[PDB]
Nucleic acid binder design. Structure first.
Ligand code: ATP
Ligand code: CA
Ligand code: CA
Ligand code: CA
Ligand code: CA
Ligand code: CA
Length: 901
DNA sequence: TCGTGTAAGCAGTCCGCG
DNA sequence: GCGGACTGCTTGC
């Protein structure tokens, strides 16, 4: 097999590399790597190295890495550019792995771990590590085993061994319900004292040294706690054994307000799953406790126990250990679904970076572009300092607030990357500038043609047409990967809809789910077999189809994010290729493209309808248009349609055979106008939306920019078994809106779009009547909580104190004197409830940590004093009034002359 | 919230508005 | 009460 790296580090003048050799074995080596950097040289000096602008360079070979770094400093002192890759480990990987890396994940040691620490005096701070580590569960991907280290004797209690037999039993048998599929994979090790536990853990770690290290909050809690606890008991040298090279660094992570410390373990790649989830999931959750996320992702019930976690070990050690094990398994289950580890490895090896660098698109693209340029003997420019400067972004059309009955939407495939490719936007393809006219002059095609030689953006920039820039070249490669995975995702989605239809008529039989590849549209033979299957088999197939769709989603959406991140990075001062000329070239072209195509679509539709000046495009944001299809339907007449699916077919055909060719013609003209390198503006139909045929549903509505709802029958070629709501911006989509309120608002919208005014009125009346019965957590608002200390004046709200911070201050007064009560953590999320006048808490609201029950000390009082009237008005009635007034509809029945009977 | 970009919505504070 | 200036938060692209 071809060799591949596992980890790489610079330690002084040495590269430390862990890698898989050609026989599939893990090895470690120290290499005295001699880096090269570059300086500009005279034209007369023969060379094969050139900078990205074609200026010749001399290569400078250094005796060591320190000499290279010192040379960079002196070049700054002199005032001359020091060219080349200044991150020497990236240069090392580029030299050592000069080929597309093919990796074998089965050879990569992926460790998932979690620790328990009993603490009687509050949260056990990792920087202090003053309490014993009393449990570690460490899953190893190569062994496929859960290694359990269990402390039986502690100053906080002596306990009996954990029982695997009780652990396996149902909760109803008094067991812990540790999943049967992992029972045989547990290796249980009890210990008489903490010193022996930790010494054995370190010996185990030496034998099975993680390459990828993950878990939940491991970077912020488990790793620093373990490091500091070992450091406190044994000293620094022993704690450094967590690093295969015995090197660690306390790393200070800084943000807008305050900073925190993590421990860098040289030769390990830490990918904290909470951070993977936050970057790659595209959710925004009210809470990030493992319980909360596991319930959301897997539909598993919360791990239930009695009393505080600080007393769980002494009261129920059995459950304490089982829950530690299950917690590790839950992360593995989430990854089996979301496949974020697989993604990180794919992207990391593609870029040739430390795997943990996948969190940084700037680092990722720096590596990709460096490797690409190096292939041609080209030399990357030195990074420079730039002041942060604002620049313009996208155009968003102001919609007329209204109901919109029939709607078809269209948007550009990978808009900004497509613009980069079309225009040929790259640091080294800049050809010059032209005299800019107002944007509307380009939009309306009255401005003079920018260039007869170069490819242009309406911000004034001109680009070479003879050759592709490195940015277009590399962005295309990742775009092509994205396209492949999106294909699999959409096929799985379409396959899912087939199964859902079949589920209307399940067969009374005993059978098996079909062995199929859900990434490809089901053949006719598979469809016929599906129509004969039982509900059990069909539901298992639906589950598998949906898991395939999720896998495709992860792969495609994060590749989309990477290429969009390149366009964004051009506007970040820390990017080697930062250039506001290029950043603005993209965004300004985008504004033109949207408004240009709005004009073209309006022109086309006025032509087919025989009208003048009519606005068919009702809305657009960045790269999208929403087209009113009422007149198209009305030209045929609703009476002529057999059912809903019939008019959906008709609009689908109209979009594909009439609209898209017209859009394409419009964009081809624009490409010629701007003299672009290649026509790549592909604006495909997204949604077909409308009310069910013969209903009183309104179909859709807009309240304003970035705020709308559509009843969708077909999305990017997926024809739904049941209509699906596309809701954007509205409160149903905001993590701040209470859970039960999101649900109620969604049903209100569903009724508006599908059933009509009278149906909406019936539901409103019932919700208003019953909502006080809802569980307090389900009706609590949510907010991130920053700057608690800033607004805290002697425990009371200072000037301009935000509402949610006021709530936290209220909470803090109510729990004062308790070391056991949960503390609100700066920067994390809180639930928030309004309080009625004259409550014992002395203020108008209270807040507590999200994803948790409020502490028993105050729960009963909070419940008694909760202001249901304010809650309802703020979270439900106000947004609903917004929806209904926009839609020209009433949520309460108005009086009429009929009432007199 | 360490980690690519901008546009833009709504909640709430403060305070003007005769 | 509603708006504007402002902070804070969050979402859509
Ligand atoms: N997270 C982001 N970071 C930077 N730019 C973004 C981001 N999301 C969207 N954009 C910009 O807005 C443009 C349009 O967004 P959109 O969500 O339609 O994605 P897209 O790149 O066009 O891909 P798709 O083919 O899925 O529509 C992007 O091309 C870019
Ligand atoms: Ca725990
Ligand atoms: Ca798009
Ligand atoms: Ca059937
Ligand atoms: Ca879009
Ligand atoms: Ca599309």
């Amino acid at each position: 097999m071809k060799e591949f790296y596992l980890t790489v580090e610079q330690i002084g003048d040495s590269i430390f590399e862990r890698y898989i050799d050609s026989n599939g074995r893990e090895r470690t080596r120290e290499v005295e790597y001699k880096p090269s950097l570059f300086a500009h040289c005279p034209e007369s000096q023969a060379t094969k190295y050139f900078d990205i602008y074609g200026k010749p360079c001399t290569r400078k070979l250094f005796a060591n890495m320190r000499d290279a770094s010192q040379w960079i400093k002196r070049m700054e002192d002199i005032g001359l550019e020091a060219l080349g890759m200044d991150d020497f480990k990236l240069a090392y990987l580029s030299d050592t792995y000069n080929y597309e890396i093919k990796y074998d994940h089965t050879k990569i040691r992926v460790a998932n771990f979690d620790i328990e620490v009993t603490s009687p005096d509050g949260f056990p701070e990792p920087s202090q590590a003053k309490h014993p580590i009393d449990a570690i569960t460490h899953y190893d991907s190569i062994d496929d085993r859960f290694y359990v280290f269990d402390l039986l004797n502690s100053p906080y209690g002596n306990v009996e061994e954990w029982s695997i037999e009780i652990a396996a039993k149902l909760q109803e048998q008094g067991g812990d319900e540790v999943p049967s599929e992992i029972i045989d994979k547990i290796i249980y090790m009890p210990f008489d004292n903490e010193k022996e536990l930790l010494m054995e853990y370190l010996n185990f770690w030496q034998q099975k040294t993680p390459v990828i290290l993950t878990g939940w909050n491991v970077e912020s809690f488990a790793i620093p706690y373990v490091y500091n606890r070992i450091k406190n008991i044994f000293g620094e040298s022993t704690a450094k054994r967590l690093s295969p090279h015995r090197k660690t660094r306390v790393k200070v992570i800084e943000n807008m307000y305050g900073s925190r410390e993590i421990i860098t373990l040289f030769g390990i790649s830490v990918l904290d799953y909470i951070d993977l989830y936050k970057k790659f999931s595209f959710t925004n959750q009210p809470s990030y406790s493992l319980d909360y996320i596991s319930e959301f992702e897997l539909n598993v019930g919360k791990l239930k126990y009695d009393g505080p976690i600080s007393k769980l070990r002494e009261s129920n050690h059995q459950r304490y250990i089982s829950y530690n094990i299950i917690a590790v398994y839950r992360v593995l289950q989430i990854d089996a679904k979301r496949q974020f580890i697989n993604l990180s490895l794919d992207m990391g090896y593609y870029a040739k970076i430390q795997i943990q660098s996948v969190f940084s698109p700037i680092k990722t693209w720096d590596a990709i572009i460096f490797n690409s340029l190096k292939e041609q003997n080209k030399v990357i420019p030195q990074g420079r300092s730039h002041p942060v400067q604002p620049y313009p972004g996208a155009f968003v059309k102001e919609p007329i607030p209204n109901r919109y009955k029939y709607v078809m939407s269209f948007d550009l495939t990978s808009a900004y990357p497509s613009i980069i490719r079309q225009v040929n936007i790259s640091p080294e393809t800049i050809a010059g500038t032209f005299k800019v006219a107002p944007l509307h002059d380009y939009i309306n095609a009255v401005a003079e043609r920018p260039s007869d030689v170069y490819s242009c953006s309406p911000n004034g920039m001109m680009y070479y047409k003879d050759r592709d820039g490195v940015v277009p070249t590399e962005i295309t490669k990742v775009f092509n990967q994205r396209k492949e995975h999106k294909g699999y995702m959409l096929a799985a989605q379409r396959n899912g809809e087939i199964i859902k239809e079949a589920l209307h008529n399940p067969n009374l039989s005993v059978d098996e789910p079909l062995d199929v590849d859900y990434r490809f549209d089901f053949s006719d033979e598979i469809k016929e077999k599906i129509k004969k299957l039982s509900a059990k088999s069909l539901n298992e197939m639906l589950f598998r189809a949906q898991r395939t769709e999720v896998a495709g989603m992860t792969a495609q959406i994060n590749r989309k994010a990477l290429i969009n991140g390149l366009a964004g990075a051009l506007g970040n001062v820390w990017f080697r290729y930062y250039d506001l000329r290029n950043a603005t070239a993209i965004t300004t072209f985008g504004q033109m493209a949207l408004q240009w195509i709005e004009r073209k679509v309006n022109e086309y539709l006025n032509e087919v309808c025989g009208t003048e000046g009519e606005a068919f495009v009702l809305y657009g944001d960045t790269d999208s248009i929403y087209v009113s299809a009422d007149k198209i339907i009305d030209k045929v007449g609703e009476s002529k349609f057999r059912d809903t699916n019939h008019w959906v077919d008709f609009l689908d055909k109209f979009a594909r055979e009439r609209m898209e060719p017209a859009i394409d013609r419009g964009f081809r003209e624009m490409c010629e106008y701007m003299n672009n390198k290649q026509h790549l503006m592909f604006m495909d139909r997204e949604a077909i939306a409308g009310p069910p045929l013969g209903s009183k549903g309104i179909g859709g509505f807009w309240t304003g920019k970035k705020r709308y709802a559509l009843n969708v029958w077909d999305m990017e070629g997926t024809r739904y078994a049941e209509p699906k709501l596309k809701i954007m911006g509205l409160e149903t989509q905001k993590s701040s809106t209470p859970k039960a309120v999101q649900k109620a608002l969604k049903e209100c919208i569903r009724r508006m779009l599908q059933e009509g005014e009278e149906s909406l009125q019936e539901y409103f009346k019932e919700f208003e009547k019953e909502f006080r019965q809802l569980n307090y957590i389900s009706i609590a608002s949510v907010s991130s909580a920053n700057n608690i200390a800033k607004y805290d004046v002697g425990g009371f709200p200072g000037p301009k104190c935000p509402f949610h911070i006021r709530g936290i201050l209220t909470y803090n007064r109510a729990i004062k004197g308790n070391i056991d009560a949960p503390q609100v953590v700066e920067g994390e999320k809180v639930y928030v409830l309004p309080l009625r006048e004259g409550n014992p808490f002395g203020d108008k609201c209270i807040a507590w940590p999200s994803g948790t029950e409020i502490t028993d000390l105050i729960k009963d009082d909070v419940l008694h004093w909760m202001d249901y009237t304010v809650l309802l008005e703020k979270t439900f009635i106000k947004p609903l009034e917004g929806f209904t007034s926009a839609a020209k509809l009433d949520y309460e029945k108005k009086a009429s002359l009929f009432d007199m009977f």
